[PDB]
Symmetry: D2
Subunit: 256 residues, 4 copies
């Protein structure tokens, strides 16, 4: 049986490493993207070249805003992403909420305030919520006899948000929401044997903070994070749910 994985923000960096890892384990992969169409399609071509019909791409803005066709709501856009997996491959075994907007929202010195709120909160928390709902309904709507045997949802959190980055309040809040989503979803979806966990990087693939990481005194590679993600998706991890794993080289253990 060939399992399917949906990965948001799959075009590059961690998202792309995650998709590659899942693909190397035999997953067919639905690569979501927002703006990185060229990289997304280039990745699909690589994956489909290795193994025919093992990759597709879907575009979507996951910000908590209406888009033009009545207006399309973020929920609808999310349901469509999950539906694209069932339409093409007839299944969706794994969901990885990786897409994430990250920029300052200082408390100390309108259009910007409102789009920032919906963008940061949508991508990091609200989209993943609706995505999980859509994913869950599909599974519930599948007759028990026909369900997969290893449903796994991974939320990309942040190992460092408890030690807030000065000026990033909304981003930090959204990640805090995502942690709550992880726990609440693990509990409510446990009956459908759908596991929900979180993976929190510290510093990965930076574009003198490296030297602060206790382990290796450097940021991590994408693989050093994606391997963790892949492991949590494996049947060997089927008893793990509702937990967040830090992948930070001990950075969260430090103090100023």
């Amino acid at each position: 049986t060939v399992p399917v994985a949906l990965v948001t923000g799959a075009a590059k960096r961690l998202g792309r490493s995650i998709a590659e890892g899942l693909h190397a384990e035999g997953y067919a992969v639905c690569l979501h993207y927002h703006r990185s169409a060229a990289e997304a399609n280039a990745l699909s071509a690589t994956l489909n070249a290795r193994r025919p019909n093992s990759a597709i791409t879907v575009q979507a803005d996951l910000s908590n805003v209406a888009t033009a066709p009545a207006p399309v709501t973020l929920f609808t856009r999310c349901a469509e992403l999950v539906a694209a997996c069932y339409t093409h491959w007839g299944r969706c075994d794994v969901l990885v909420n990786n897409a994430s907007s990250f920029y300052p929202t200082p408390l100390l010195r309108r259009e910007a305030m409102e789009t920032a709120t919906a963008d940061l909160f949508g991508s990091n928390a609200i989209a993943p919520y609706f995505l999980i709902k859509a994913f869950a309904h599909r599974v519930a709507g599948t007759p028990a006899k026909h369900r997969g045997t290893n449903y796994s949802i991974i939320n990309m959190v942040d190992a460092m948000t408890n030690q807030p980055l000065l000026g990033y309040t909304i981003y930090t809040m959204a990640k805090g929401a995502l942690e709550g989503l992880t726990r609440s979803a693990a509990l409510e979806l446990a009956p459908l044997q759908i596991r929900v966990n979180g993976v929190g990087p510290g510093l990965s693939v930076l574009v003198g903070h490296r030297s602060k990481v206790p382990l290796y005194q450097r940021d991590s590679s994408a693989a050093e994070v994606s391997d963790v993600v892949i492991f949590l998706c494996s049947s060997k991890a089927k008893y793990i749910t509702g937990t967040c794993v830090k992948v930070d080289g001990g950075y969260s253990l430090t103090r100023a």
Copy 2:
């Protein structure tokens, strides 16, 4: 005479907090959404005890426009109301909170308003309120600033042990915890303290209470508001970015 703004001050915990702060000498701006009668009754009681020690302000803190007026604007206006009437705002208490199911498992705009209401009241409104509050302090010349600025976020001691079916509420509380820490850090330079108070079971609607280790009952409003009040006192000036459980040990239990 210090001023305190308390959202959702009309009844229950919000009312207890206002009364507590008032008993310590605070002038209190009582925010309310729908409980206009209860809000005005309380103001009358407080103003009767001490002239000009209470006002009331109506506002929907759901992340939606009204009349268009954005949530941020409505929030700025709440804080402005304090400076307009009394010329100051020393304490902010983000207490207002919507609480109802958002099941993941068995409706179009039903989830739309739920999203904006649950997230607005519990997280986004508090964010804008804190911004507005922080902005007024920063805009106040150092010599004229108060000496005990305190923001309290009402969190939930039990959200790490999620209530089945309440994902969006739980998510909003998680955001509020993040707001508490991020704000404490960024506002430390203005000497504005930001903390959280997390009830377990308090003043139940109407069992579940027999589950509480301590006293085997839910708490009274005072048992929570006193903690809020203490965190606002100058005896607590070194505390910031922390959340205090007031749950009688409920979070220490397991199924």
Copy 3:
């Protein structure tokens, strides 16, 4: 008149705690290990303000047997501290596990002794003594007929707001503090039926010792987000006192950081 036992009461945070409780009307049993002169000076001050409101008891809380007053065990020494409260005043309403040894136990580089004594000292003072003290305290309340019990039993464990961001080289100390946090939760749960509340207070930097260059000391305190300084003893003891008040009677099993946001920082 309610009684409070405070371990390591002779100076610094322990003294401030005793003074605070004393200012609220508590009679205070001041425990000390080596600071006899400081302890007696404090008792004198408290007894001078209010006759018979203070006493002092000496005890090594390290997890080692002591010279017969058959060797005396740590548990026995702990029971005796609690007993000294009931013997003199007929009661013990509040316990504050404040005493604490603090020094390096590096993982990397007349010798065994230092290893075996460090283990028992750091662990005893910070965790094991508090355990037996709580047991003793718990036993005395349980042995009191309901009709004679106090109405506000409170136990406070002094923890560390920064142990989750370990100080390099202090593994055993950090370990003992983690054990203390465990004790706090387990005790709150088990003693809830006797209405004995058990909480923790975790300082960050308080009355930071200045055995180092002025600038190096400016550095450390400047890392605290709020006020860019370590705290005074009062800024911590007032929190302790509050947790002991009847206005905190619904709080139990919780640890309160008093760190001015220090734990929110990163390297």
Copy 4:
């Protein structure tokens, strides 16, 4: 061919962990206290599968001095376990602090009992692990850089449920809290030697069934995922993963393996 020392390896989780590591090619030093028969049986199986891939060492990890052949301290007995790995195979790449005593130490409802309970519960769950880590760390530091292994990993078996204390188990819960502290402090201090230190916290695994079937069923039925306790393998696979080179950026973290049990409330 890497070496792994596993304490309390004789049965249950310890055994599953040794088997897991053995299946990955590790040579395994199986520590035991009282389960000599089960320990030797396991060694035989492993050695039969791959010659000279298993040994055993007996040791009481309680924080008490043992009788020789001058009393032996816990630290010495700990160094000797680590030494046994370097003596036999010339290396120790992985350490798994699995050994653990677990029994009640009530505060109420009421000897050499309390002196031994304290030392046994605290020794096995915390103090031994401390000294073992020290010993393990010294051996690595005393190895010239050019000869060091490339994947040093220490895993501490913690408890996903200690923050929701089991009534009457104060000392155990305290020792587990100390073990968590040990995990973080050690990760930090040993980072420079590239020695990773993490924790794995089971919830309910291979739940002891010494009670009415209904009572046993009620207990496991509380676990949200599968409504059952876990198998040993469902825990050991996590341990094994954390030891793999794919996990070489993870350190100072504790991973719950509890099927969501810690998410529940009374």
